[PDB]
Amino acid sequence: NKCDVVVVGGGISGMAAAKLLHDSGLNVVVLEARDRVGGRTYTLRNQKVKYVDLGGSYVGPTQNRILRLAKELGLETYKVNEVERLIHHVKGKSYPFRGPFPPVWNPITYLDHNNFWRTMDDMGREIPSDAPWKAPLAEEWDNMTMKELLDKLCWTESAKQLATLFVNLCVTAETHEVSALWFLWYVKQCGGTTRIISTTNGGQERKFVGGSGQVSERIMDLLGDRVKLERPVIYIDQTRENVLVETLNHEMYEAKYVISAIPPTLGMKIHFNPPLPMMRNQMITRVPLGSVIKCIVYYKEPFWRKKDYCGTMIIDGEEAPVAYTLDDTKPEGNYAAIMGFILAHKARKLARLTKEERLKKLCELYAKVLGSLEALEPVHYEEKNWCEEQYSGGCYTTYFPPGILTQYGRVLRQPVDRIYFAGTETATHWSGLMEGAVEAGERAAREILHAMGKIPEDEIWQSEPESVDVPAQPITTTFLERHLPSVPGLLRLIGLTTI
Amino acid sequence: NKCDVVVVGGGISGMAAAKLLHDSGLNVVVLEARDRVGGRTYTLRNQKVKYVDLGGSYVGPTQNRILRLAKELGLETYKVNEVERLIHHVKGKSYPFRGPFPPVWNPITYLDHNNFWRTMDDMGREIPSDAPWKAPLAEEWDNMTMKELLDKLCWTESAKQLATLFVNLCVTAETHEVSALWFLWYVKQCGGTTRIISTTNGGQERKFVGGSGQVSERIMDLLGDRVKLERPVIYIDQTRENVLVETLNHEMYEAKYVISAIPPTLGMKIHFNPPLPMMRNQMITRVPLGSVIKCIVYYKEPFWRKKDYCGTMIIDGEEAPVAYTLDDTKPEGNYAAIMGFILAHKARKLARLTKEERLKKLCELYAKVLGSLEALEPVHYEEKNWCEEQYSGGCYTTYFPPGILTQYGRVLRQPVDRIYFAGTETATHWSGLMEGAVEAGERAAREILHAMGKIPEDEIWQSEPESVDVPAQPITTTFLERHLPSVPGLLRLI
Ligand SMILES: *[C]C1=C([C])[C]=C2C(=[C]1)N([C][C]([O])[C]([O])[C]([O])[C]OP([O])(=O)OP([O])(=O)O[C][C]1O[C](N3[C]=NC4=C3N=[C]N=C4[N])[C]([O])[C]1[O])C1=NC(=O)[N]C(=O)C1=N2C#C[C][N][C]1[C][C]C2=C1[C]=[C][C]=[C]2
Ligand SMILES: *[C]C1=C([C])[C]=C2C(=[C]1)N([C][C]([O])[C]([O])[C]([O])[C]OP([O])(=O)OP([O])(=O)O[C][C]1O[C](N3[C]=NC4=C3N=[C]N=C4[N])[C]([O])[C]1[O])C1=NC(=O)[N]C(=O)C1=N2C#C[C][N][C]1[C][C]C2=C1[C]=[C][C]=[C]2
């Protein structure tokens, strides 16, 4: 009933906010719609898999907040398998390689690929992480889709196809669905192209032993009966001295402040009194989440390793249901498994099939890519289509269609009277991921602490010490990578020598 | 409590559905979130204006359903003033003209303008009204914004600027915000470029005497206590024999079927049990409404008429708060007024100002465009910013960003168990307008009648006889309009 702060949403962000406030001595309540905490993280446990992350899973260097929170809760990480060769499957053929990027041999295609990634990061440097709408060319970039940008930048189909796969994989959306400004911000605020795409030294380096769901679960353990499950919030009334928060199951909660720790668009599920300001009212109708099915196929052994394949496959082409896989085998070497994502339009298209039909398609794909009949012999299968989730809206995160980030972006984490906004979408570093969830939850909590006069203004945003367990190697480039011309750059160079 | 059909939303679509079901002998309840009916229509009454439409207002030829429904309810229309000259204000100068289209005199510009409008309609002919995702090039066109299309098609800045204004005015959204497929469908399903843009013989020909709000009000009068105001729906449960509909004010309604007559995205405000199917679950997060402030400045006299101006202004350029106006003077010739729309990003930008500040900006603009100091002497002002409305989400209607219509469009009016979908967004003719609201409400009602075995399948969709009061003249083109080359066409010929 009565408390200091109501946190709407018991995902990592809401739980991190609640924990910080609780630790500070405030009385907090977490109102969670589902019969579980964790939200876009979910760790299934059964005898066949032991445990498996069906939602958010990967953590890595530079994600120091999630690493610190998890460590404090008694969790450990392990390294995703990248010992053996990666595979790039292009035009029906597999090409093994090493390093974050698939190598390209054609001199022209090489220049084009090199220029694409370089330009993505170049453009990124012009975009403030905490205010992407302040980029010098914000409007120009926001008024273009990523498809238009790729069409302009890529002088080869090879680069365009790989860039497209990259976008689909990064933000579970099609290149024509998303703003170029927003996508460029998204990559930059994850530390750039190399950091976001890498397993070793990147966002996919590690997973939590026992699953990421433990983060939210262990915070719930700490908070006890303060977490209220199956309490979807339907109504927030700020017309009186204390904020009134009502749930679907007919309960009323009274608080000094509220943290909204749900995906921005899911704010639509709440009726507000007084109405939201115009900009937020419209913003929450303009910000969809992406589409993805996370699929894990289990095998007797990690047979790919015997062929000097680590389990990573970058698979291009419309026919492939999954465009990207990672080895999901336990650190102990058992429960051998391949994790694959079915992305964007394919999540929509293939949702029509049965679980068994999807398993068959994945195994047949993997058999071809790995050149291994063993891939046709799965022992178990688990999957989760996040598009079906009423209380998520999709995964991994919210994307911005053209024109929206510049017009409505500044509204995202602007308080509405006594409502403050958490959720990974409001983060400024690794927004979209578990790291961003922690950053945003703790920042929102500290905004309330400041509002109560408990901390100074300069303590709202707090730096995080680097993990000792997961140190970050710097992202480096070669002289040639920095200075090799683009394709049009080479053509202009030829033109001047001709003239 | 218990009834045959619960209609969620008491706008024109919900009211039209409820009326049809009521007339058929079913027990209906309308659950309306606001303290009023009408939704995206709202007629304000006061001494200063008598009445004024602050939402949907215009009707015209080919909109036979809204005209028939209004007539039955005892309403009449009158013609929007288009006797005198229209004005196109370009690069700081006013150019008076007659006919629906502002003329162009540069020959290359003429070819470009002609080709643009022609191509819009050409493309439209390949788009099925009831299934735009079935267009032969549906994916190609859906994966482009209108901005990209205009960039490809328009070889002149003049054409591109006017095309942009057209998009902004049509769908209260920026060219880069919207799918080309969806926009081309939108225009085509309103009868094409000429029909949608025209006052005389088009969508802006007429208004209702006394206001369009009377449509929803008079149906509420007919239905009596069946309409429940300040009942926002929060929860729909379909797990049991009868559908359970719960409201915010703690009431429970039980019905055999439900009609959702709210903007698609506002379905998000309802918690569903069981959850919605995947495609609808995501669809309702992908479909925003546009942004507009409707502004009416009142004057002592319709002074523009004295200068042989009808009051229609098409105003190019970023600086102008309002890109389009119409004379809003009463049929009697009193309550002289100019109606203007503040569109898309300008609605966002100018919302920051006070009502008085917007009035000043509009009056100064009108003084410039009309070349009249009389425009600086308003006697009254009314405005409505639809972006602020929790239970609308915007106006005039829902737009589809690139990629959405092809991926999710088929979901729009697909029933979910015992929930059927009305609302202007689900119409196949004049979707977005009051006409579409009536079409969709009556179709949704008839889907339920068919589900109950009361009517055959072929009666779900019903043709509408042409209004005798507002007959439609055909849209015609000249030989030269049809056959003159585009700019690249002329270049290839050279
Ligand atoms: C789903 C997913 C997947 C499948 C995957 C992934 C993910 C996801 N991610 C993301 C994560 O998960 C996120 O971010 C997080 O989790 C978030 O958090 P937050 O913010 O907290 O949120 P949430 O969870 O959602 O929560 C919320 C809550 O609330 C609630 N509600 C609602 N509504 C309501 C409520 N309550 C009350 N009332 C009302 N009304 C709900 O229920 C919930 O609970 C991720 N992340 C990370 O970190 N990691 C990972 O891994 C992930 N994932 C993914 C990834 C991928 N990656 C890839 C690979 C390769 C590559 C890539 C990318 C790029 C490049 C390369
Ligand atoms: C806003 C607006 C404006 C400003 C303008 C306009 C408009 C609008 N429009 C549109 C109309 O209005 C519409 O369409 C209608 O109205 C719709 O209907 P419906 O479908 O029925 O829907 P609504 O109204 O929205 O209703 C709904 C209801 O529901 C409710 N809710 C919500 N949620 C809920 C509820 N309930 C319970 N629960 C829950 N949860 C609400 O409240 C409501 O009530 C229009 N239209 C027509 O027809 N006309 C006109 O005029 C209009 N407007 C406009 C126009 C413009 N035009 C222009 C000029 C020149 C040109 C143009 C265009 C193109 C070319 C040229």
Side-chain angles (χ1 to χ4, degrees), chain B residues 182-193:
Chain B
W182 170 82
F183 184 79
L184 294 167
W185 167 79
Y186 190 87
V187 173
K188 178 260 181 57
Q189 62 93 34
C190 289
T193 57

Side-chain angles (χ1 to χ4, degrees), chain A residues 145-397:
Chain A
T145 65
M146 275 303 295
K147 187 182 175 290
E148 301 177 57
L149 183 58
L150 300 190
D151 286 347
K152 292 177 193 293
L153 248 283
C154 301
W155 285 63
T156 64
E157 278 303 303
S158 166
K160 191 188 293 198
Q161 285 158 13
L162 184 58
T164 298
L165 191 155
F166 175 67
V167 173
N168 299 163
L169 178 58
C170 274
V171 298
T172 61
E174 305 289 332
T175 55
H176 62 262
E177 286 171 342
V178 307
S179 158
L181 177 65
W182 171 80
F183 184 78
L184 294 165
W185 166 80
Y186 189 87
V187 173
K188 176 259 184 59
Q189 62 91 37
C190 289
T193 59
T194 301
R195 190 74 74 188
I196 203 175
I197 75 146
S198 295
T199 296
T200 301
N201 201 38
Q204 283 69 240
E205 194 181 84
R206 289 159 182 270
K207 290 159 61 91
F208 290 114
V209 174
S212 65
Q214 295 177 108
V215 177
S216 296
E217 288 160 358
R218 288 189 182 195
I219 297 166
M220 173 171 60
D221 292 341
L222 293 172
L223 293 171
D225 67 355
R226 294 173 188 82
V227 180
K228 317 293 183 185
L229 302 176
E230 300 189 83
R231 267 72 167 197
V233 172
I234 57 168
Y235 182 65
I236 295 174
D237 180 351
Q238 300 197 82
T239 61
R240 304 178 195 277
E241 190 200 308
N242 300 325
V243 185
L244 297 166
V245 184
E246 189 174 15
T247 62
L248 187 61
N249 67 131
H250 308 281
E251 292 174 350
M252 190 70 70
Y253 295 83
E254 202 166 325
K256 296 182 177 69
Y257 303 93
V258 174
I259 291 169
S260 175
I262 65 181
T265 193
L266 295 195
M268 285 281 285
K269 299 205 130 333
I270 304 168
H271 299 244
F272 289 92
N273 190 19
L276 296 175
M278 155 197 78
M279 293 300 285
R280 194 176 185 88
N281 181 51
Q282 287 205 310
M283 182 273 288
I284 60 176
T285 68
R286 283 158 154 75
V287 288
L289 290 85
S291 302
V292 60
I293 313 175
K294 186 174 178 79
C295 309
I296 305 91
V297 180
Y298 294 83
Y299 294 101
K300 188 174 178 59
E301 303 290 347
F303 63 85
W304 46 95
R305 298 182 184 179
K306 307 205 313 288
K307 297 196 171 193
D308 202 29
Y309 297 142
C310 66
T312 304
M313 297 174 260
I314 300 164
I315 310 165
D316 196 358
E318 181 55 34
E319 319 74 28
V322 168
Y324 192 80
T325 70
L326 292 165
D327 188 336
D328 210 46
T329 304
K330 299 285 184 284
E332 291 75 21
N334 54 2
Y335 305 88
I338 297 287
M339 186 284 311
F341 289 119
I342 301 177
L343 300 163
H345 81 278
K346 294 173 190 177
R348 269 99 66 169
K349 183 201 171 204
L350 301 177
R352 302 180 216 171
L353 305 176
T354 65
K355 185 182 172 177
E356 293 73 25
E357 280 170 333
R358 278 183 297 277
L359 175 59
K360 186 179 161 73
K361 278 187 181 297
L362 268 52
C363 289
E364 290 179 351
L365 177 63
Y366 300 163
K368 190 176 209 156
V369 181
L370 295 170
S372 304
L373 293 171
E374 298 165 277
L376 302 177
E377 309 295 322
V379 300
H380 192 71
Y381 181 59
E382 298 287 353
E383 59 167 26
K384 189 157 181 69
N385 183 345
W386 287 86
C387 306
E388 71 200 6
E389 289 299 302
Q390 178 164 208
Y391 296 111
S392 297
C395 259
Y396 329 134
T397 196

